[PDB]
């Protein structure tokens, strides 16, 4: 993912998810930063994993 | 045991130019006065000369 | 020589004090403005402390 | 139920019910599927 203007509040305000868990940042501050390169990864696992 | 969909985002935070930024947009500059600046996501309190 | 050694010892001590402002001591950064622009208030306290 | 913690984000924290970070006191929750759900369209939240 590159060369965008990404909104992030359209994601976590939508209550689709049961696990939102950010590590180096906080989700409030994500509408204020600039990220230099963004990668996204996708897979499907079981419940407890 | 039910299936779950998992997305993992990862990024750098201060490097060579910004290239992905947030939903906010600029204001105009004010000089010789204490402000809270924000240039490409690097904040700080100072006086811009 | 005895007068120059006083000036040399008083300058090594002030240069060590400036150089220690770029250590992070276990935090995520050594810059205080990057902890404050990336973490919400509860998480930030543990890093500024 | 995970959004009734001292410092979260979502719908209940951002628009409905916000707790302060300096918070002392307990949070209790329990399941009531039978007595409340007949869909019953009187329970509301702010979008």
UniProtKB/Swiss-Prot annotation, chain A:
Effect of residue 18 to F: In strain: Omicron/BA.1, Omicron/BA.2, Omicron/BA.2.12.1, Omicron/BA.2.75, Omicron/BA.4, Omicron/BA.5, Omicron/BQ.1.1, Omicron/XBB.1.5, Omicron/EG.5.1
Consequence when changing residue 14 to F: In strain: Omicron/BA.2, Omicron/BA.2.12.1, Omicron/BA.2.75, Omicron/BA.4, Omicron/BA.5, Omicron/BQ.1.1, Omicron/XBB.1.5, Omicron/EG.5.1
Positions of the UniProt region annotated as Integrin-binding motif: 46-48
Top-level taxonomic group: Viruses
Cited function: Attaches the virion to the cell membrane by interacting with host receptor, initiating the infection. The major receptor is host ACE2. When S2/S2' has been cleaved, binding to the receptor triggers direct fusion at the cell membrane. When S2/S2' has not been cleaved, binding to the receptor results in internalization of the virus by endocytosis using host TFRC and GRM2 and leading to fusion of the virion membrane with the host endosomal membrane. Alternatively, may use NRP1/NRP2 and integrin as entry receptors.
Subunit description: Binds to host ACE2. RBD also interacts with the N-linked glycan on 'Asn-90' of ACE2. Cleavage of S generates a polybasic C-terminal sequence on S1 that binds to host Neuropilin-1 (NRP1) and Neuropilin-2 (NRP2) receptors. Interacts with host integrin alpha-5/beta-1 (ITGA5:ITGB1) and with ACE2 in complex with integrin alpha-5/beta-1 (ITGA5:ITGB1). May interact via cytoplasmic c-terminus with M protein. May interact (via N-terminus) with host bilirubin and biliverdin, thereby preventing antibody binding to the SARS-CoV-2 spike NTD via an allosteric mechanism.
Name by which UniProt lists this protein: Spike protein S1
Organism: Severe acute respiratory syndrome coronavirus 2 (2019-nCoV)
Taxonomy of the source species: Viruses, Riboviria, Orthornavirae, Pisuviricota, Pisoniviricetes
Gene name tied to this protein: S
Curated annotation (Swiss-Prot), chain C:
Coiled coil region boundaries: 4-48
Stated consequence of mutating residue 37 to A: In strain: Alpha/B.1.1.7
Function according to Swiss-Prot or TrEMBL: Subunit of the fusion protein that is processed upon entry into the host cell. Mediates fusion of the virion and cellular membranes by functioning as a class I viral fusion protein. Contains a viral fusion peptide that is unmasked after S2 cleavage. This cleavage can occur at the cell membrane by host TMPRSS2 or during endocytosis by host CSTL. In either case, this triggers an extensive and irreversible conformational change that leads to fusion of the viral envelope with the cellular cytoplasmic membrane, releasing viral genomic RNA into the host cell cytoplasm.
Protein name per UniProt: Spike protein S2'
Gene: S
Range of the intact protein held here: 946 to 994 of 1273
UniProtKB/Swiss-Prot annotation, chain D:
Region annotation (Immunodominant HLA epitope recognized by the CD8+) ranges: 40-47
Subunit organization: Binds to host ACE2. RBD also interacts with the N-linked glycan on 'Asn-90' of ACE2. Cleavage of S generates a polybasic C-terminal sequence on S1 that binds to host Neuropilin-1 (NRP1) and Neuropilin-2 (NRP2) receptors. Interacts with host integrin alpha-5/beta-1 (ITGA5:ITGB1) and with ACE2 in complex with integrin alpha-5/beta-1 (ITGA5:ITGB1). May interact via cytoplasmic c-terminus with M protein. May interact (via N-terminus) with host bilirubin and biliverdin, thereby preventing antibody binding to the SARS-CoV-2 spike NTD via an allosteric mechanism.
Protein name: Spike protein S1
Main function: Attaches the virion to the cell membrane by interacting with host receptor, initiating the infection. The major receptor is host ACE2. When S2/S2' has been cleaved, binding to the receptor triggers direct fusion at the cell membrane. When S2/S2' has not been cleaved, binding to the receptor results in internalization of the virus by endocytosis using host TFRC and GRM2 and leading to fusion of the virion membrane with the host endosomal membrane. Alternatively, may use NRP1/NRP2 and integrin as entry receptors.
Gene name per UniProt: S
Organism encoding this protein: Severe acute respiratory syndrome coronavirus 2
């Amino acid at each position: 993912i590159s060369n965008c203007v990404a909104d992030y509040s359209v994601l976590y305000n939508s209550a689709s998810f049961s696990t939102f868990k950010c590590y180096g940042v906080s989700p409030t501050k994500l509408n204020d930063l600039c990220f230099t390169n963004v990668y996204a990864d996708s897979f499907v696992i079981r419940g407890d994993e | 045991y039910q299936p779950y969909r998992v997305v993992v985002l990862s990024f750098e935070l201060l490097h060579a130019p910004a290239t992905v930024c947030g939903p906010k947009k600029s204001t105009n500059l004010v000089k010789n006065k204490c402000v809270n600046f924000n240039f490409n996501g690097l904040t700080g309190t100072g006086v811009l000369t | 020589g005895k007068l120059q050694d006083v000036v040399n010892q008083n300058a090594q001590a002030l240069n060590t004090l400036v150089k220690q402002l770029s250590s992070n001591f276990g935090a995520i950064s050594s810059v205080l403005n990057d902890i404050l622009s990336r973490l919400d208030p509860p998480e930030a306290e543990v890093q500024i402390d | 139920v995970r959004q009734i913690a001292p410092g979260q984000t979502g719908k209940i924290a951002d628009y409905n019910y916000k707790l302060p970070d300096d918070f002392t006191g307990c949070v209790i929750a329990w399941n009531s599927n039978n007595l409340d759900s007949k869909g019953n369209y009187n329970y509301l939240y702010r979008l």
